[PDB]
Amino acid sequence: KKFPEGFLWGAATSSYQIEGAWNEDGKGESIWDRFTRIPGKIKNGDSGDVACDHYHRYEQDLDLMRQLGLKTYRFSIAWARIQPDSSRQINQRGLDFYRRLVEGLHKRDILPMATLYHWDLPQWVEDEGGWLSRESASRFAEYTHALVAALGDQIPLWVTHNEPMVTVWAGYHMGLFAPGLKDPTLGGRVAHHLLLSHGQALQAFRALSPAGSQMGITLNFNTIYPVSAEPADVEAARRMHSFQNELFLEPLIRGQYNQATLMAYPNLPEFIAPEDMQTISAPIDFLGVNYYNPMRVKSSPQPPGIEVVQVESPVTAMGWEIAPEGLYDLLMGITRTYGKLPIYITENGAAFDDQPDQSGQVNDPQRVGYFQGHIGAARRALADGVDLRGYYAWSLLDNFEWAEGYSKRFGIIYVDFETQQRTLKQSAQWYRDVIANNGLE
Numbered sequence: 001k002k003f004p005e006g007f008l009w010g011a012a013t014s015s016y017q018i019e020g021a022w023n024e025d026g027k028g029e030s031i032w033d034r035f036t037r038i039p040g041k042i043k044n045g046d047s048g049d050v051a052c053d054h055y056h057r058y059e060q061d062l063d064l065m066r067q068l069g070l071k072t073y074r075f076s077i078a079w080a081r082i083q084p085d086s087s088r089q090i091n092q093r094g095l096d097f098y099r100r101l102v103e104g105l106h107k108r109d110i111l112p113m114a115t116l117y118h119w120d121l122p123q124w125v126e127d128e129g130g131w132l133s134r135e136s137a138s139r140f141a142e143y144t145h146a147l148v149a150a151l152g153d154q155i156p157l158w159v160t161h162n163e164p165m166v167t168v169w170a171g172y173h174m175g176l177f178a179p180g181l182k183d184p185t186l187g188g189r190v191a192h193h194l195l196l197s198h199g200q201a202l203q204a205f206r207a208l209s210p211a212g213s214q215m216g217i218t219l220n221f222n223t224i225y226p227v228s229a230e231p232a233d234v235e236a237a238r239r240m241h242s243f244q245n246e247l248f249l250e251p252l253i254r255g256q257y258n259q260a261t262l263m264a265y266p267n268l269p270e271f272i273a274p275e276d277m278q279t280i281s282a283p284i285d286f287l288g289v290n291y292y293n294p295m296r297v298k299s300s301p302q303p304p305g306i307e308v309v310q311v312e313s314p315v316t317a318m319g320w321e322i323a324p325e326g327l328y329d330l331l332m333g334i335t336r337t338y339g340k341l342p343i344y345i346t347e348n349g350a351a352f353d354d355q356p357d358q359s360g361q362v363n364d365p366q367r368v369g370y371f372q373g374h375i376g377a378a379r380r381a382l383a384d385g386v387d388l389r390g391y392y393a394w395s396l397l398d399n400f401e402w403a404e405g406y407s408k409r410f411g412i413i414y415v416d417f418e419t420q421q422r423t424l425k426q427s428a429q430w431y432r433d434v435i436a437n438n439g440l441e
């Protein structure tokens with residue numbers, strides 16, 4: 001029942017999804033500033049120009065974190081605030097903001113976890129080739145060094161990347177997210193340079209070696225289940241798992257790409273230099289796990305011989321299936337396959353239609369049911385030997401949900417985007433009790 005003494009209960013956000021002040025204090029343009037100017041790309045023509053106006057209101061948000069009793073808070077750093085342009089010079093005002101944020105967290109006994117890259121690449125980096133260019137791994141490492149040198153001993157947990165797979169799939173295969181390319185053959189190349197940037201960032205971290213600080217990476221996964229017990233379906237499920245869930249994990253832990261990856265991207269070995277794989281697979285301090293839903297697959301006659309079968313119920317407002325057993329299986333599978341390493345669930349959460357009632361309360365019993373089941377599955381994984389050190393709710397605040405804009409609300413705290421007024425939902429109240437009790441009712 002009760003989690004371990006000192007278990008780190010938290011909530012998470014990302015810079016572009018909450019900060020606003022998109023052009024203030026010397027901040028540079030990011031690929032998402034640019035992307036949200038293009039008509040038709042975002043529902044309702046929404047953008048992150050203002051978002052939760054967190055850059056201006058962070059002290060209020062710091063107080064909200066204290067109100068919930070968070071032991072930890074996960075955010076991302078906007079690279080374009082730190083290095084607005086191709087001169088690579090550090091913008092001191094951008095840096096001051098994260099210094100102030102982190103100082104406020106320690107003031108309130110909240111341990112900081114910072115994600116260096118949560119998708120808002122500076123436009124200047126994109127003009128130098130973006131993730132297609134190998135040199136971007138070096139720009140990322142320089143950016144990392146600056147941030148770790150400045151805040152290393154103030155930030156005990158560092159994540160290099162959030163969900164490199166989504167940057168590949170949504171950013172380059174589908175054109176759904178920035179930078180908006182639609183060429184499948186570019187995937188392997190991008191993936192390699194994302195991995196390489198992580199490796200070079202971790203080197204920079206070890207060189208600085210800040211006291212009491214650790215560094216890792218966050219990956220997303222969708223637990224794969226075959227739609228039937230038929231051998232073709234099992235085989236499609238196995239290949240889908242290798243690709244969807246181990247494209248990054250395998251080279252990170254084992255130092256090599258798996259077969260399903262090399263077959264999906266035949267030209268991949270062309271970007272791999274002689275010590276890349278060693279750099280990529282150097283020891284991380286912990287793994288960040290993001291999870292929302294499973295994927296159910298069947299075999300297909302047409303390439304690539306895999307079909308994802310859509311589920312109609314039970315789902316969230318995103319249409320994503322609700323299956324807590326999927327989180328438990330993912331955690332058990334990682335721990336069995338790669339060994340018992342430290343894991344933080346860095347995002348787990350759900351979107352539902354939220355509407356303040358006449359009295360202004362925001363009651364979201366379906367979000368409470370989602371968290372109840374998932375935190376319960378996490379506790380079972382811990383009981384079964386998974387080294388789980390923390391759990392972060394996605395998200396602290398309703399925010400800019402990428403291509404869905406503001407039409408999707410993931411927050412435990414409701415945000416009225418007209419007034420910037422924040423309201424604890426029923427789920428935040430509930431979660432506060434979980435933290436106080438250090439476990440479920």
Ligand SMILES: OC[C@H]1O[C@@H](O)[C@H](O)[C@@H](O)[C@@H]1O
Pocket residue numbers: 014017162163166220290347394401402410
């Ligand atoms: O779609 C829900 C959430 O998914 C996670 O993959 C991303 O890291 C978040 O930025 C996003 O809001």
